[PDB]
Amino acid sequence: KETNYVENLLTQLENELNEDNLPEDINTLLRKCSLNLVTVVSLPDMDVKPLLATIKRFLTSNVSYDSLNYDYLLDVVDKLVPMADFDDVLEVYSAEDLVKALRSEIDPLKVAACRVIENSQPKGLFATSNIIDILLDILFDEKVENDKLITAIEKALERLSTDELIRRRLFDNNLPYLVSVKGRMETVSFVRLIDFLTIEFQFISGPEFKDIIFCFTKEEILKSVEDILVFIELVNYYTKFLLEIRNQDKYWALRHVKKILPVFAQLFEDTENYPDVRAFSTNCLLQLFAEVSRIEEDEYSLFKTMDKDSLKIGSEAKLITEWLELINPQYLVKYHKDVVENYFHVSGYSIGMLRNLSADEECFNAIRNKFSAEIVLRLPYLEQMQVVETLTRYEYTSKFLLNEMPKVMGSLIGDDLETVHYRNSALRNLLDKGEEKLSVWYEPLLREYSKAVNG
């Protein structure tokens, strides 16, 4: 239907606010405004200048109200600014008005600015001005404990960072300031910088990249170990970094990082000196090592040095399963055929490693011998279905499950809801092969698939 109704709700708010005294109902009205603004696409045909003028006036006026819950108002502002025509929004919240707002002491007014700056059109509007510069001083000030504002600043920054002009202001004009927060290393300020940087690396280009800000020295990483929360965030920053390297084919950045990586591995091995490292960060470190055994390099040069000197895959008794569940199976087969052959077996427990070792054909060949049709039927059905489903994932594994363990094929076809997910997953992954590849198995695979999905 024709939603006029929405503008009727906005104008009636504009009136109840411009009044000499404000009602009790105002909060339920603002909530009704926020609710009706999610619904309806960019519509209510009027330049919104009156309500935004009234809203800006209401915020600059610090005025505490017994009824008014300032959040419900800002909720309207957050939803209004993007839907509204930005050229007319710039009239109310002028380029200078925002400089004024962000430098003020009125926290709700600052937030309003961040919603305006978030919805900047064109993006590089305030890139000529020091509006970007201000936001960074607020973001990196530990005394700023306003969660709604801190986020509004980041939500605004993330949106604007797609633009080259906005990024130039950050990594050139503000680059000296950014560098100061880094060497400063105050937990709250520093962690904010980590999180700001992990966002910025998504849009940063080869030249734009400044080594000084995105990279952490060996002496930096060791200094973080004191307040373990920082080391964890740093491990994370890098696991994330080494990932948006493969997930964007940004192999250029691989030189910058390669250097400090063994530091983490060293720190991991040392327990006599860094108990906090292996206590509070074992898992996320293992995650980062998994990423190192993935990076495009001269026959795993960096990773094998990291393994020989610090990781020592296989020497570590308790860790064998973890190594076999995480580290590149291409690498695992090449350098640890021993570890892969001697420690993997086909159990309910194994599944973790089974799904990782299956990923590389060469690796799966080294663990194909551990596959009896019997050893698999020993397991309960849920385990079997996980095993079968794992084998149903790759060409070589499906081909093996179909041809070599037909007793297992029989078990899958037969004669717990989790069991069914895995089974149906397996069933379809098999039917995607085709009538030919499947052969004797196609007719029942389809029968047992229709059986499972249709009813």
Binding site: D147, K148, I150, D195, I232, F280, S281, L326
Partner: protein, 79 residues
């Protein structure tokens, strides 16, 4: 479906620790920066876990360290 913002995440953590025996100044903004793009009950489990690390170390009051142990277990912890 949508996930919680840095603010909301801290709010989950703070409202949730009320019904928990927890030490004074746990830096909840910081704990939230360690659970990015993390579900409602994912964060609630980081609390259950923190509670467990306390019980595990024969403690009643859960440390921020117990929460760090909790994050590494639930968030950084692969199934």
């Amino acid at each position: 479906s949508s996930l919680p913002d840095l603010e909301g995440r801290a709010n989950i953590f703070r409202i949730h620790s009320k019904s928990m025996s927890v030490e004074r100044g746990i830096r909840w903004e910081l704990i939230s920066r360690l659970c990015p793009n993390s579900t409602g009950a994912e964060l609630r489990s980081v609390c259950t876990e923190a509670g467990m690390f306390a019980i595990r170390a024969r403690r009643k009051v859960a440390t921020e360290k117990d929460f760090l142990k909790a994050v590494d277990k639930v968030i950084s912890g692969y199934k």
